[PDB]
Amino acid sequence: SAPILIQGAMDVEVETLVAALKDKQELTVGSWTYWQGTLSGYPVVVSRTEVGLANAAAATTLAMERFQPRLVINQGTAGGHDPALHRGDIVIGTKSFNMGAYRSDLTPAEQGVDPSKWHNFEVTMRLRDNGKLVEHSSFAGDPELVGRALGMADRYRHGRVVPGIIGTADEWNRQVARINWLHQTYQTAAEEMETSSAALVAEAYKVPFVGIRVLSNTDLHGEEFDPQTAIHCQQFVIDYAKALINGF
């Protein structure tokens, strides 16, 4: 009877989920609202996380403490990093990582600022397990959960469903050269602001996790934000959750 936890950051990324639940009960603690109900007769909790790494981690931790979910699906919209992808495509996160984590080597003021010399700062993803330090350079999507989403690709009719790497940061990048550099360096499919943070907390609690992100925008093709993509993503996720539930 442990629920599926489904997350979205903004109201537009959760309202379609909420509408799908039967016998809803709403809970708000701190800044974070949860709707507890059923899908196909099975317990599901929808979480509106708010935006960014701190919010995502708090909302995920609070859900672990309150609901003890059996798996977490983090979803919502993202911006394209891979030129092959277009608005409406859905990325299933083979892995996510904190793309915004940076360490730089000492340079005197005369040398100016050069972000291309910044290194990914992996300590931000380091955890402890039974008190012992465990390094992480990324968080893998649960591979069975990833595979399931890919196997359901043809049920999504508003773009392609592809595996990719999700770069999480407290950033919205619109400098195309920066997007290109991040893609070349980290092989990112897309950027957003929550996935690796929720994933970090899921790893700490040893709960299976998958990130599912629709491209609502990509400055690589001049495609501006389309809020309807967030609805289409939730529709896919409802179908996906119901498939999991059929198998329970």
223 in a labelled binding site:
no
Per CB under 6 A, the segment of 24-32, 59-67, 72-80, 231-239 that binds ligand 5AD is 72-80
From the list a copy of itself, ligand 5AD, none, partner contacted by residue 53 (C-beta under 5 to 8 A by kind): a copy of itself
160 in a labelled binding site:
no
Q: Is 77 in the site for ligand 5AD (CB under 6 A)?
A: yes
**Binding characters for ligand 5AD, 96-135, by CB under 6 A (x = yes):** ---------------------------x------------
As a whole number of angstroms, the distance between CA 44 and CA 24 comes to: 10
User: Which phi-psi region, left, alpha or beta, contains residue 148 (left: φ > 0; alpha: ψ -120 to 50)?
Assistant: alpha
Reduce the DSSP state of residue 50 to 3 states and report it: coil
Is the separation of the CB atoms in 185 and 49 below 8 Å?
no
Reduce the DSSP state of residue 217 to 3 states and report it: strand
213 in a labelled binding site:
yes
As a whole number of angstroms, the distance between CA 26 and CA 37 comes to: 9
Residue among 104, 91, 82, 46 at smallest CA distance from 182: 82
171 in a labelled binding site:
no
CA triple 207-208-213, angle to 5 deg? 125
Q: Is 9 in the site for ligand 5AD (CB under 6 A)?
A: yes
126 in a labelled binding site:
yes
Tokens read off for 98: 């904190």
**Binding characters for ligand 5AD, 159-178, by CB under 6 A (x = yes):** -------------x------
As a whole number of angstroms, the distance between CA 228 and CA 235 comes to: 11
Return the number of the residue (37 or 52) whose C-beta is nearest ligand 5AD.
Answer: 52
Q: Is 192 in the site for ligand 5AD (CB under 6 A)?
A: yes
| Least CB distance to a copy of itself at residue 96 (A) | 11
Reduce the DSSP state of residue 126 to 3 states and report it: coil
Residue ranges binding ligand 5AD (CB under 6 A): 9-10, 51, 76-79, 123, 172, 191-194, 216-217
Annotated binding-site residues read 126, 172, 191, 193-194, 213, 217
